[PDB]
Design a protein around this nucleic acid. Structure first.
Lengths: 64, 146, 51
RNA sequence: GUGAAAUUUUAGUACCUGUGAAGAUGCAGGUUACCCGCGACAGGACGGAAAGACCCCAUGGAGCUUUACUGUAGUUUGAUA
RNA sequence: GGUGUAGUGGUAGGAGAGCGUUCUAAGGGCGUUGAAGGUCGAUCGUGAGGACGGCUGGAGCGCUUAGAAGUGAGAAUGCCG
RNA sequence: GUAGCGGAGAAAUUCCAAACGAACUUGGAGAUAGCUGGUUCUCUCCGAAAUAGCUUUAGGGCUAGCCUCGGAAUUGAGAAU
RNA sequence: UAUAGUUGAAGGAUUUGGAAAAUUCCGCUAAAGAGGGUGAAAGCCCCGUAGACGAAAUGCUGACAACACCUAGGAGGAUCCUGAGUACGGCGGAACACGAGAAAUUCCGUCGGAAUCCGCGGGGACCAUCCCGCAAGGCUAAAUACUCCCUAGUGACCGAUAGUGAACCAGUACCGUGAGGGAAAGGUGAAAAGCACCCCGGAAGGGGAGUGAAAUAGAUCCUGAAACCGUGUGCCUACAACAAGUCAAAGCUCGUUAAUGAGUGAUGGCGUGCCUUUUGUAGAAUGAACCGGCGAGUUACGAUUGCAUGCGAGGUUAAGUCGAAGAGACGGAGCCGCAGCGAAAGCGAGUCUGAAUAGGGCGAAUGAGUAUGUAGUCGUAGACCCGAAACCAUGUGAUCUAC
């Protein structure tokens, strides 16, 4: 049959123009009294997926 | 070519690897699998993306956004592609098709200015960026959103 | 060529001979034979379909 | 006269003191010993028979208990036909 | 092709290049003046392996090039004899 | 006559066709087993690990570290004094 | 048209054999050189094949006839009709890819319960407006699924431990109260010509003589491997502690694919099997009595990388139609690539964040793809093979034992 994509990954990630994967950040929904303003200012910028994670993740997102 | 002297091209066919056929081949006795463990069993292995029991990377990250149901995507053609027409032609979505430049015009054509025109066209399309229309009109033609 | 049926009947059954019409030549028919004996009409008909 | 069995890597299958997966017929150094059998005894072959029943594990089972969780047959109480 | 210099222990495992079995196609062959199979020999190659000769045997079988695989056995307290 | 989510028991977890903490037969069924056993031809080149971190994790796994094959790249980035 | 049938071309000698279809000469035939048989391998010997011909009877399928049924316009808009315990709503369940969810639509149980063309339902809670339909009555060919069976065939499918469990009198013998479980076992020769007669012996069996190309092809019958059991001989062996060989070597006995020959060997040096699992094994850790046969990374569909070929800012068709189960043309729905950024509205070689033209993120700046073949890895499927204790759902047992 066909391969099924991981529907939980696809709701969380997107594919950039040179093949990468933009991602959101953690520690960004919850107790902000436990973290500094500089931390929460700098946890507002997106990032990318690392090479260890991508090697193990590649096949689940092949089609979207 | 005669049917008793066939020859494929070099590098085009390779043979095959058969495991479990003696020691000297390199892959007898456990056939490349190492010693014991879950990965040495028939049907052994863990599912894709599994990580032991640590919280998997998809599950620490938050979800994001929504899909719009009235989304419009267009079928860009820039400015070099309008150089393969004669000086004065009235380029249009049916003359773009039937040259194969555009097949599958999603929600209509949109012209983009990247980067250089020298013709006398009169372009008919659904959308124009500010610089596409501009450079089209410098070279000496006209636009009409339709 | 075509409904040249007397010729195809006469040429059957000879153990060195194969018979094909001009709308039904394959790659394997031409490679296996040593020669081709084609009529003038059939030659133009082949030139019409290979174009 | 008739006629099995469990067992079995191949065997021309000694003793002492050592060595060694730390208790050797088979390895070292010695000592003893012509070749082939019969009737008897059980010290060794970690002798044979039974992939330890003792102990721990498998995110194994199964039977049992209850003020462990989540359900339910049965019994009861109200509304409505 | 010559000549120099350097190298060539190996378990898990990666990479290369080959030997042999059965069947398909095309080509060129052998066979009751004896095919396959079996048995013996003091033969050849760096290895898997290849020939030639005797005896047995009685009807089928090699070689070249390409293709396809139920394609190689010493072990599972394996299964049948 | 009483039948397996069952029967029968002067009560022993006792009996229900030489086996009963839940009979026998067929099917789901090639149940599942992070465990144990086995896995069949040849030569040439290279050649590990037995560690860190996280883990209902500790004889399993994942990412890094350590092996092998193919490419790219400015160098004079590597080593030993 | 199905179910019996008819007719159907063309060869002799020679060599080797028991026997030719083989060999060598010289001929003929083909709308027939597909296949099977015959004392070995046949276009021309036999049965057939290509082509031509045929049905008393019964059954099927067409066509055209009869017979049976069914089917008309224009206008009016006074009034009447158009499927009721129904649509629908509350409560409880289920079906829709949709797990109560913001839950439209379709069903079942229970209770409540419309309107009538100035009407009624739907467009995914709900309302208004616009648009598309007219429930609560019935039937209907084809295009799609399957093969116990009959005819005609096909296979880079098996060839007697294979292929059906079963090539043979097989669901048999055998096992169980029963439901149920379930095998082993093919081959003389061209032709039985299958050994008349004699001799030893109760017979079995054997030796002659005969058959036959061959009997060491004699019915336990083609070939006839190994384990295992014997008989005969060249060389060694009764003072010797041996994982059984290997290297050195006198004597004896032979004489080969002819070369730095072959068998045996007193005596001397050295030397703790094979496999598995282990930090580590001769292991007193694990497996194997021996010999033979069988017995384990495969395929389908997807995803990715390397190699190879054709086209190249492009590449390529799917289902389907004609065609020999084929090649070999039609078919452009569709798929990938050619532009990105942003949650989105959107903007575009740029865009998002931002008051910012600042800075920063991701992109551009000549920067190659696509179809197919082949090999390496992965996913879904039993997915390299063998191995539980158990769980569930139909059925069969009180001829033993308990009451």
């Amino acid at each position: 049959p066909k391969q099924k994509t991981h529907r939980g990954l696809a709701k969380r990630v997107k594919r950039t123009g040179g093949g990468g994967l933009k991602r959101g950040r953690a520690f960004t929904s919850h107790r902000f009294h436990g973290k500094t303003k500089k931390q929460r200012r700098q946890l507002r910028k997106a990032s990318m997926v690392a090479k260890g994670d991508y090697k193990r993740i590649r096949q689940q997102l092949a089609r979207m | 070519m005669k049917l008793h002297e066939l020859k494929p091209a070099e590098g085009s066919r390779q043979v095959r690897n058969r495991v479990g056929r003696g020691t000297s081949s390199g892959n007898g006795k456990t056939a490349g699998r190492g010693q014991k463990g879950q990965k040495a069993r028939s049907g052994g292995g863990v599912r894709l993306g599994f990580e032991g029991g640590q919280t998997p990377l998809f599950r620490r990250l938050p979800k994001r956004g929504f899909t719009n149901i009235n989304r419009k995507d267009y079928a860009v053609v820039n400015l070099d592609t309008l150089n393969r027409f004669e000086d004065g032609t009235e380029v249009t979505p049916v003359v773009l098709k039937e040259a194969g430049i555009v097949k599958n015009e999603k929600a209509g054509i949109k012209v983009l200015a990247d980067g250089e025109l020298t013709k006398k066209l009169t372009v008919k399309a659904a959308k124009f960026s500010k610089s596409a229309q501009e450079a089209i009109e410098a070279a000496g033609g006209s636009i009409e959103v339709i | 060529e075509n409904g040249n049926d007397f010729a195809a009947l006469s040429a059957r059954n000879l153990p060195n001979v194969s018979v094909v019409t001009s709308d039904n030549v394959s790659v394997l028919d031409v490679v296996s034979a040593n020669k081709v004996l084609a009529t003038q009409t059939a030659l133009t008909q082949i030139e019409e379909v290979l174009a």
